[PDB]
Amino acid sequence: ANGYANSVYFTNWGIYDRNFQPADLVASDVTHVIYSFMNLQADGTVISGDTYADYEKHYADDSWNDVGTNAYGCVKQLFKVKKANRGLKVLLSIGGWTWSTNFPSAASTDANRKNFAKTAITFMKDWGFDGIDIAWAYPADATQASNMILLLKEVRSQLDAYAAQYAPGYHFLLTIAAPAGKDNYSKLRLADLGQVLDYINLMAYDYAGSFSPLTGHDANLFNNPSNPNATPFNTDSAVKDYINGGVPANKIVLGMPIYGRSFQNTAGIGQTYNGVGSGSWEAGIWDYKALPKAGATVQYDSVAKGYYSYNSATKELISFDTPDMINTKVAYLKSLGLGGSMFWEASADKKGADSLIGTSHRALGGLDTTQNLLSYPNSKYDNIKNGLN
Numbered sequence: 001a002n003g004y005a006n007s008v009y010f011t012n013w014g015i016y017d018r019n020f021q022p023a024d025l026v027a028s029d030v031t032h033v034i035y036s037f038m039n040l041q042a043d044g045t046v047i048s049g050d051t052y053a054d055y056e057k058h059y060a061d062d063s064w065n066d067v068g069t070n071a072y073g074c075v076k077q078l079f080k081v082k083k084a085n086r087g088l089k090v091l092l093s094i095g096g097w098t099w100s101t102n103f104p105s106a107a108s109t110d111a112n113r114k115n116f117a118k119t120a121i122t123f124m125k126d127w128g129f130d131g132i133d134i135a136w137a138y139p140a141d142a143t144q145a146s147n148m149i150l151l152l153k154e155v156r157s158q159l160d161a162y163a164a165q166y167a168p169g170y171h172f173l174l175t176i177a178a179p180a181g182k183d184n185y186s187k188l189r190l191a192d193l194g195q196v197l198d199y200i201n202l203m204a205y206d207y208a209g210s211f212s213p214l215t216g217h218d219a220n221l222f223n224n225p226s227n228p229n230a231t232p233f234n235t236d237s238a239v240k241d242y243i244n245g246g247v248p249a250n251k252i253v254l255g256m257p258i259y260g261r262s263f264q265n266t267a268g269i270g271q272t273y274n275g276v277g278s279g280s281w282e283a284g285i286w287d288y289k290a291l292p293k294a295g296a297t298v299q300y301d302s303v304a305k306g307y308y309s310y311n312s313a314t315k316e317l318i319s320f321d322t323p324d325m326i327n328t329k330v331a332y333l334k335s336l337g338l339g340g341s342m343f344w345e346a347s348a349d350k351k352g353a354d355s356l357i358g359t360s361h362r363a364l365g366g367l368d369t370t371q372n373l374l375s376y377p378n379s380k381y382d383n384i385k386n387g388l389n
């Protein structure tokens with residue numbers, strides 16, 4: 001890359017209740033959109049989890065009387081974004097937290113890995129995307145960890161062979177969503193990942209919530225020796241283990257949450273709580289654009305480098321990232337020579353000055369300007385093949 005990544009996950013289910021369409025992305029701030037998620041079968045078959053959201057939904061300017069076989073849905077909307085933002089690459093993300101059960105089987109044989117690569121790359125080239133993100137949560141043992149590398153090498157091989165025929169000289173990107181927990185990342189073939197991948201999206205969040213015995217920072221940088229119950233994990237120990245394990249610092253993109261985890265009936269950070277309570281869309285989880293709530297004040301753990309709203313009246317504490325937290329995390333990643341910022345996920349961000357993604361863009365400065373691809377002469381969709389001209 002020729003600068004920092006400022007990447008964001010865009011969810012295909014966000015077009016429904018969250019009403020967040022690809023045209024809603026503030027694309028000027030973004031180097032990579034990671035389109036989430038494709039589903040996976042045990043025989044390695046990559047499939048759409050929602051054909052409506054992916055390529056069937058007609059937006060206002062999508063003709064119900066055009067000739068040929070055409071892609072609509074988020075695929076055409078994201079191609080429009082790529083046309084208007086030549087420095088913005090779109091990656092196809094496969095798996096995710098809820099859809100990782102079939103990865104061990106999918107990676108387990110040469111035939112299943114070839115089927116995974118062919119079906120994944122078929123979507124990528126039909127939809128007019130710039131690469132593939134493997135979101136396998138998470139390889140469980142040495143067999144799975146080894147098979148993950150064999151799978152990534154098969155995808156890399158087939159991407160290079162596809163480019164040689166249908167996008168000569170273009171480098172399709174291959175990335176993973178990577179775990180921040182040592183129980184998970186100690187099982188990975190880190191040096192192999194460091195060699196085969198363009199980027200490792202480090203999921204440096206979900207450190208504490210309903211699954212934690214006490215209130216914790218969700219995404220803190222450092223251990224708090226004074227209040228260690230508040231920092232059950234920290235980003236810094238994971239980042240150092242990834243780099244020392246053989247992932248080059250410049251390939252590590254530091255993930256950051258655009259949501260908070262709430263703790264109810266609590267005196268503060270590192271302490272007893274009872275329930276996670278309500279959420280924006282699911283129990284205990286709040287969109288950043290809904291934070292801080294009315295009457296809550298933002299406190300700061302300057303050791304663990306964690307911000308959290310506290311409401312003295314309601315006793316609600318919400319761990320979440322603020323614009324100031326983003327400035328600190330950007331200073332941190334530049335200090336370690338990391339590849340940039342990643343965000344989960346786009347729909348929850350604020351607009352204007354208080355955009356976490358926009359704060360990251362201004363704090364990073366020199367963003368990746370590597371050009372995307374607009375030429376898909378082997379796309380089965382006439383409108384994509386014709387670049388929506």
Ligand SMILES: CC(=O)N[C@@H]1[C@@H](O)[C@H](O[C@@H]2O[C@H](CO)[C@@H](O[C@@H]3O[C@H](CO)[C@@H](O[C@@H]4O[C@H](CO)[C@@H](O)[C@H](O)[C@H]4NC(C)=O)[C@H](O)[C@H]3NC(C)=O)[C@H](O)[C@H]2NC(C)=O)[C@@H](CO)O[C@H]1O
Nearest residue numbers: 013016017018096097098135136137177203281282285344
């Ligand atoms: C590799 C890895 O572990 N990545 C982590 C992410 O997976 C994780 O974010 C969470 O991801 C899961 C899917 O993996 C996602 O699940 C979705 O949940 C929503 C409800 O919030 C469902 O949305 C509905 O979809 C239907 C149509 O299918 C709509 O009709 C309806 O309107 C939708 N309702 C709402 C309220 O939006 C999705 O169907 C469902 N998707 C899947 C594929 O199961 C979670 O919401 C994600 N969690 C958060 C907090 O965003 C992430 C954060 O924990 O960590 C990642 O890096």
Ligand SMILES: CC(=O)N[C@@H]1[C@@H](O)[C@H](O[C@@H]2O[C@H](CO)[C@@H](O)[C@H](O)[C@H]2NC(C)=O)[C@@H](CO)O[C@H]1O
Nearest residue numbers: 097180181182184203205206207209210211233
């Ligand atoms: C650092 C670490 O290993 N944390 C684990 C958490 O990631 C994980 O919580 C779950 O993480 C998912 C993706 O990161 C979230 O989408 C999901 O909402 C969350 N689960 C719940 C119930 O909130 C848990 C596994 O439950 O283990 C932690 O140790």
Ligand SMILES: [Zn+2]
Nearest residue numbers: 016017018019
């Ligand atoms: Zn609904």
Ligand SMILES: [Zn+2]
Nearest residue numbers: 056058064072
């Ligand atoms: Zn139609």
Ligand SMILES: [Zn+2]
Nearest residue numbers: 160170171172
């Ligand atoms: Zn290359």
Ligand SMILES: [Zn+2]
Nearest residue numbers: 171173197198
């Ligand atoms: Zn590369």
Ligand SMILES: [Zn+2]
Nearest residue numbers: 361365366367
């Ligand atoms: Zn800029």
